[PDB]
Amino acid sequence: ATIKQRTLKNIIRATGVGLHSGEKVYLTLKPAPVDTGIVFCRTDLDPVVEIPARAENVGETTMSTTLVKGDVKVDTVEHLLSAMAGLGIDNAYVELSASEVPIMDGSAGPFVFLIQSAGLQEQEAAKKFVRIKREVSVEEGDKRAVFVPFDGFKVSFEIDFDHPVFRTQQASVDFSSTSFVKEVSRARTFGFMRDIEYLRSQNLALGGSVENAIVVDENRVLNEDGLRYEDEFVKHKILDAIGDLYLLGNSLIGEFRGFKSGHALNNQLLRTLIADKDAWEVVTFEDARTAPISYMRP
Numbered sequence: 314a315t316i317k318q319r320t321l322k323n324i325i326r327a328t329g330v331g332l333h334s335g336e337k338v339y340l341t342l343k344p345a346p347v348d349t350g351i352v353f354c355r356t357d358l359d360p361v362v363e364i365p366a367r368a369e370n371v372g373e374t375t376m377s378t379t380l381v382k383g384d385v386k387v388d389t390v391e392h393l394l395s396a397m398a399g400l401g402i403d404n405a406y407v408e409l410s411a412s413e414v415p416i417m418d419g420s421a422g423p424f425v426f427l428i429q430s431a432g433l434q435e436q437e438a439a440k441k442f443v444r445i446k447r448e449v450s451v452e453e454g455d456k457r458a459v460f461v462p463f464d465g466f467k468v469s470f471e472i473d474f475d476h477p478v479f480r481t482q483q484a485s486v487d488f489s490s491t492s493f494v495k496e497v498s499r500a501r502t503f504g505f506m507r508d509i510e511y512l513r514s515q516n517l518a519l520g521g522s523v524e525n526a527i528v529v530d531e532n533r534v535l536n537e538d539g540l541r542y543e544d545e546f547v548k549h550k551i552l553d554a555i556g557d558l559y560l561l562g563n564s565l566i567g568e569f570r571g572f573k574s575g576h577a578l579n580n581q582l583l584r585t586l587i588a589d590k591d592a593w594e595v596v597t598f599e600d601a602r603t604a605p606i607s608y609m610r611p
């Protein structure tokens with residue numbers, strides 16, 4: 314039968330702090346009707362300001378992916394969106410009491426746990442996918458982000474950081490067969506000490522600590538208990554790309570390859586894709602058995 318749209322089965326509540334703002338924030342995830350998409354709702358404002366998590370609403374892409382509507386922003390959406398994408402949630406309202414999603418432990422792990430504890434609900438409408446049919450590339454200097462046709466969903470990333478902690482970093486994950494939860498969800502964000510005074514002077518990384526980030530000095534990881542994966546850095550790049558890519562508003566059938574890319578170039582890739590309507594089409598699957606991707610039991 315049809316691959317169906319999914320929402321949350323129960324409401325999820327969490328409390329935390331913004332990575333960049335350091336502000337205390339209350340998060341509530343709620344079920345939503347078919348074809349809603351993921352919508353962020355600033356419930357601290359009167360009237361409540363609602364910003365769909367779509368490429369067209371992205372404003373800043375400096376350190377994190379920020380959604381903007383007028384002078385209202387929702388910062389650092391990428392880790393929560395990665396969790397939504399990885400678990401195949403189409404529709405949800407994300408209520409926030411402040412301008413930034415809580416950082417939690419720096420990864421998507423707490424979000425996938427909270428969501429999977431609440432359970433998902435399959436809905437009575439076909440899931441829509443955006444299928445890549447032509448190569449679409451954006452470049453800026455030595456950075457590159459590309460979509461390639463691929464019968465499934467796969468993300469590759471290569472980073473060239475000149476830094477002792479890497480002993481070149483590259484990974485490729487095929488989710489049409491390897492699972493977001495186990496391969497990527499637990500990969501934490503990271504920051505270099507050389508940047509933190511500068512960042513904090515610009516009101517960035519104000520909530521950052523060893524509790525919610527891999528902190529790297531000149532030569533080593535400062536976190537007492539070390540890394541969750543040997544290649545945690547590049548796995549986090551992949552986590553970020555999955556989230557930024559979900560700003561398309563539908564799951565992808567295709568391959569993403571990133572080369573020193575980040576939030577700004579990821580968003581540029583989506584905008585270029587959306588503009589080139591020869592490069593993609595919207596599809597559904599009336600038989601899950603012949604589809605190129607699958608999802609975990611809800």
Ligand SMILES: COC1([C@H](NC(=O)c2ccc(C#CC#CCCO)cc2)C(=O)NO)CS(=O)(=O)C1
Pocket residue numbers: 375376377378391392502503504505509518521522523526528549550553575
């Ligand atoms: C821009 O850097 C990335 C970004 N993370 C951050 O900007 C970022 C993450 C953590 C910190 C920190 C810290 C700290 C500390 C202790 C001293 O106060 C500072 C910045 C992030 O994960 N955005 O989603 C994208 S990435 O290269 O994969 C990591």
Ligand SMILES: [Mg+2]
Pocket residue numbers: 391392502549553
């Ligand atoms: Mg990140």
